[PDB]
Recover the amino acids of this structure.
């Protein structure tokens, strides 16, 4: 492949990843893949956003869309061509473009979409389309089971306000993988990204709440970095400690 | 007859009020009273915090506690001596001291307490006792009625992040009264108060959502001001418009 996608922020390509259209796919587990799409900024470079694809028996579950509807449609085509299994549902982590930019692609494909109820409420103001179903959460952050039917190994957890007020996280039961979304940055991150809609008071405790909810997860997946160790949880929690 | 209680910030005592210990109670409707507690800090002065007391049939419903357990305990003494009806439940509008400082007094009295699930999640890190039950809200902002058992005329609505990420509002059916809490300031206020836990981006949209959820409320009740007209909603929303 003469000429590969090398973004300015986000992980770089390496053999073991599979370039598919404008996107990059990396297998993290026998049944878990990471999908990476790129937002080409006008004179700034590609901005990578990561999600996850999970095979649960005869169906496939998706975590987070791509930046655009087109890149999200390419994800579904990669699923049909490489896994050849229907997508049962998708769950998006919060109401920003890198997570809900491709809702129209999922809804055109007939896939049931789930999000935090606050995400569906904030999606109008963020220029996003809400998900079809709303997730609600208990007082300790765990999702109400009645609102997440047939989620399989997807264990959804709301850690509290951090990167946004509505950011949620997803642990993959039966694996050692947990997804932190835009709430967690890698262990060598220089900052905590876009603090525009961030909760600077509760960010630190929300990072640890995510780590305490999945204490056995050794691989942590985030939006704009290669999968890291639990030191990613630690680094951003102490980075957010400086926001006092 | 000289000498009353004089808050440093908050409404004065007007004719038609009634002092009862450290509090003052003002009747707003045949079955709706407003309670006001005072937090005095050595060297700064007293700050007033307003809540609501609703008589619905043969029971009393309380909205928000006082600053302290002791002040809250005097609220139920006022209910026992001025109404003498059982206090069915209590709903608190967000996890801050002026609205949740007296949770232990209600729990010791055998009163069922209700709060936004986010308020209960944030309660330990804000120094508050979490409520006994959690309220969840749909994407449109209205409370899921399965978690608000027998609230009577109380119409709970979550307008979105504003003063805090968890502030909720309450309307009283059969009256012209809706409670904005700390989200809405009076029509001649010069600031939005404490913005440390505030969502500067969605404050304006959350204030307007509160006004649209209770379009018949001609009398708006807030935390640190005498009740005002709907002009308080517009003045709060336009003040928050400059925050973006
Ligand atoms: C990639 C970033 C460094 S900025 C970015 C992201 N931004 C977007 O997806 C779009 N800029 C956007 C445009 C309009 C509305 C919402 C998002 C977000 O705020 O999560 N997240 C950052 C992050 O995840 O830390
Ligand atoms: C009048 C207040 C500055 S205090 C009140 C309340 N905030 C508090 O009680 C503070 N969290 C607080 C201040 C000093 C000491 C302890 C707590 C709220 O969030 O509605 N509303 C604020 C406001 O409307 O800006
Ligand atoms: Zn974001
Ligand atoms: Zn992001
Ligand atoms: Zn207040």
């Amino acid at each position: 492949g003469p000429g590969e996608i090398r973004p300015t922020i986000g992980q770089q390509m390496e053999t073991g990843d599979q370039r598919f259209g404008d996107l990059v796919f990396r297998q993290l587990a026998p049944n878990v893949w990471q999908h990476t799409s790129y937002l080409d900024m006008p004179g700034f470079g590609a901005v990578a956003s990561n999600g996850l694809i999970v095979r649960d028996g005869g169906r496939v579950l998706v975590v987070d869309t791509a930046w655009t509807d087109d890149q999200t449609a390419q994800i579904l085509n990669w699923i049909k061509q490489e896994i050849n299994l229907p997508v049962a549902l998708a769950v998006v982590t919060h109401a920003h473009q890198d997570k809900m930019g491709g809702m129209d692609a999922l809804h055109a494909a007939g896939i049931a979409t789930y999000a935090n109820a606050l995400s569906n409420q904030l999606a109008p103001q963020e220029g996003m389309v809400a998900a079809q179903h709303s997730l609600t959460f208990a007082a300790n952050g765990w999702v109400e089971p009645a609102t997440a039917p047939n989620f399989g190994p997807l264990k959804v957890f709301y850690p509290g306000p951090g990167h946004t007020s509505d950011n949620i996280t997803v642990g993959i039961d039966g694996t050692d993988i947990a997804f932190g979304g835009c709430l967690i940055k890698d262990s060598k991150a220089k900052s905590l990204g876009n603090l525009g809609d961030a909760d600077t008071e509760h960010y630190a405790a929300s990072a640890r709440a995510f780590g305490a909810a999945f204490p056995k997860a050794s691989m942590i997946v985030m939006s704009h970095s290669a999968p890291d160790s639990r030191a990613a949880i630690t680094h951003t929690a102490r980075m957010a400690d400086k926001l006092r």
